[PDB]
Design an enzyme around this catalytic site. Sequence first.
Site, PDB file in Angstrom:
ATOM      1  N   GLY A  34       0.809  -1.198   0.000  1.00 19.69           N
ATOM      2  CA  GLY A  34       0.000   0.000   0.000  1.00 19.69           C
ATOM      3  C   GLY A  34       0.848   1.256   0.000  1.00 19.69           C
ATOM      4  O   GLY A  34       2.026   1.252   0.357  1.00 19.69           O
ATOM      5  N   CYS A  35       0.224   2.362  -0.410  1.00 22.42           N
ATOM      6  CA  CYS A  35       0.944   3.629  -0.472  1.00 22.42           C
ATOM      7  C   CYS A  35       1.287   4.137   0.926  1.00 22.42           C
ATOM      8  O   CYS A  35       2.446   4.463   1.209  1.00 22.42           O
ATOM      9  CB  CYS A  35       0.125   4.661  -1.250  1.00 22.42           C
ATOM     10  N   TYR A  36       0.294   4.208   1.814  1.00 20.72           N
ATOM     11  CA  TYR A  36       0.572   4.554   3.207  1.00 20.72           C
ATOM     12  C   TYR A  36       1.577   3.611   3.860  1.00 20.72           C
ATOM     13  O   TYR A  36       2.548   4.104   4.460  1.00 20.72           O
ATOM     14  CB  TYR A  36      -0.728   4.582   4.016  1.00 20.72           C
ATOM     15  N   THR A  46       3.950   1.918   2.643  1.00 19.03           N
ATOM     16  CA  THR A  46       5.273   2.177   2.086  1.00 19.03           C
ATOM     17  C   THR A  46       5.956   3.331   2.811  1.00 19.03           C
ATOM     18  O   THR A  46       7.151   3.269   3.118  1.00 19.03           O
ATOM     19  CB  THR A  46       5.170   2.478   0.590  1.00 19.03           C
ATOM     20  N   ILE A  51       6.230  10.547   0.196  1.00 18.77           N
ATOM     21  CA  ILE A  51       6.312   9.880  -1.098  1.00 18.77           C
ATOM     22  C   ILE A  51       5.240  10.460  -2.009  1.00 18.77           C
ATOM     23  O   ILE A  51       4.271  11.074  -1.557  1.00 18.77           O
ATOM     24  CB  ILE A  51       6.119   8.347  -1.019  1.00 18.77           C
TER      25      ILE A  51
END
Lengths: 334, 325
Positions: free
Chosen positions: A148-150, A152, A306
């Site tokens: 997942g983005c979070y 990461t 990010i």
Amino acid sequence: MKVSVIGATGYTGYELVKILANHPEFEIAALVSETYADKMFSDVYPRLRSICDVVITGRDYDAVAEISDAVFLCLPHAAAQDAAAFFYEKGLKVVDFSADFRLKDKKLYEATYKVDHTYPDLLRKAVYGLPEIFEVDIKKAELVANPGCYPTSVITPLYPLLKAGLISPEGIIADSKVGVTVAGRKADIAYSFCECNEDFRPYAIFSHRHNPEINEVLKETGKETNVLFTPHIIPASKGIESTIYTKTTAGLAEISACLKDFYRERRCVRIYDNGHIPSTADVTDTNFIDIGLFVKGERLIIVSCIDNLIKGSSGMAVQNMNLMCGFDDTLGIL
Amino acid sequence: MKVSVIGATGYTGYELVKILANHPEFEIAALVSETYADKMFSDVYPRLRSICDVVITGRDYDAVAEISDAVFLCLPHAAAQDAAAFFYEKGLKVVDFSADFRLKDVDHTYPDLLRKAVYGLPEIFEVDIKKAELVANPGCYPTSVITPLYPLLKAGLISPEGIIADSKVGVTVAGRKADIAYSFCECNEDFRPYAIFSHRHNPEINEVLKETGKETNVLFTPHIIPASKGIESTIYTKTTAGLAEISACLKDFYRERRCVRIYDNGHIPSTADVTDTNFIDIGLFVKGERLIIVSCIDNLIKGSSGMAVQNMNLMCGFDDTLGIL
Ligand code: NA
Ligand code: NA
Ligand code: NA
């Protein structure tokens, strides 16, 4: 080498096509979207006119598998499982953007989604694609669950500190913020300009699916963590900032050395210990993750930024496909 | 009643003039902005053309004292001290926006005056504000944090230790300042923390919360939102009480305070809910022994100019929401 993108007209698909058009090894075979089939990809994104004008095709997975060696799945929950199962059995390499294969424990999956996993045998073959941590596993993989983005933005700074025992595994708080592209390409009123412009809101309080992903991955450090994660929406298009609160037994220099030693060879990781404060503009439209370290007494604050659509999604996915295909993970990115 | 604004052309003075123009009892006497003197206030803010066309005057504090019963000071530090001392000695009611008189505890020029200052959080210290002549207007960040925390700590329903306040504000927090760091192109689409371990509002939060008798060590980290106005504070506390008792404690404490809107049903406040209003929206969420508080205000209104009108109303014997609700 031929690659195809399933669900190519979303925002993660757009960022993926941008990288793939310039990748020296990956050639675009098919871009799949039922909504925009028969249209050129540049009809949906005119910015890419004369850069990628590939005609979009429908969800004919059989034709896709015959002309593709690997596939990127930019599909929502459940639909990703079906596509992953099909293309895996056809012998293709698969990077799944969804969360459906991130939790290897079936009971944890059921605890999070309140339903059983539809392909539990395929689940045991999925590898968590955090390239700077699990590179050895990813190189041996055929199915990669793109993180997942979070997670990461949160796992990357916390993992080496917990492994070296420099911070407490208890009481960690991750207060994270993301641009509106987190919702994907959607027509819903909740993500319209007039509802989101000038607005800042928390959401999914005590209930975001990334929270179990974060704690389950950090288990691999040998420490059991109970990270509390709360996401927020920024009135901007892209970017994640995660303010992470930890308890530490080490000072700023020792914390910094631990992180810089662990990621010494990773050119996408930019770590600051000199008071510099990362912001989302520093990483937007890049595959970098910027980590800022701040220590006062026994308290360590980490600022982690990010691009949610690149390092949090499509750029990390290219890193994983690079590793699976025997290439340097930064090939076509740096 | 006659009131004047010192430093009126900033964003806080702008929002203050909006309220004062429609206030039933406060009559604008002078709008002092020294860089804009001899211009009409609507020359600087054309939206108020036909609404407030008062001619801005210079730094004639004698003349302001002559024609005014009370004064709002939207001045920077140090300059706010001198102006507050001058108008106090002249017998006017004073609401100071700056932090110079907030902390009752690089030496203060007017220590005896500091002891007379009352911390102007109207829903908490209304008794002391009704008797005050000098009111120190609270900061915008502390207002969003102190308001939900104060009743819970006083009732002993949350732990005073380990509280974390991760707060976010629109760019108007910087004021009407010429600075590249606050330009459109530098702030647009950007989100950033700042003042890590070092924001001046962190001590303010803990000092005021001591009044509950509980010793707190709140850790506060601010962030800049790529938007004009609004504060959102996500506040993390530990508790052994239930949601029903936490909710009841806050709703009872702020029972008759119409600017406080408390939710306990899963509704999540956002900055759009309170922008251009004087409301403070508070959402309550409990899982196990963790309480998450979501607190939103307009940083220029409930966090500044609207709260200042409440404090001036209270000093002048009026209802605190007069001219606001
Ligand atoms: Na914006
Ligand atoms: Na940075
Ligand atoms: Na809202």
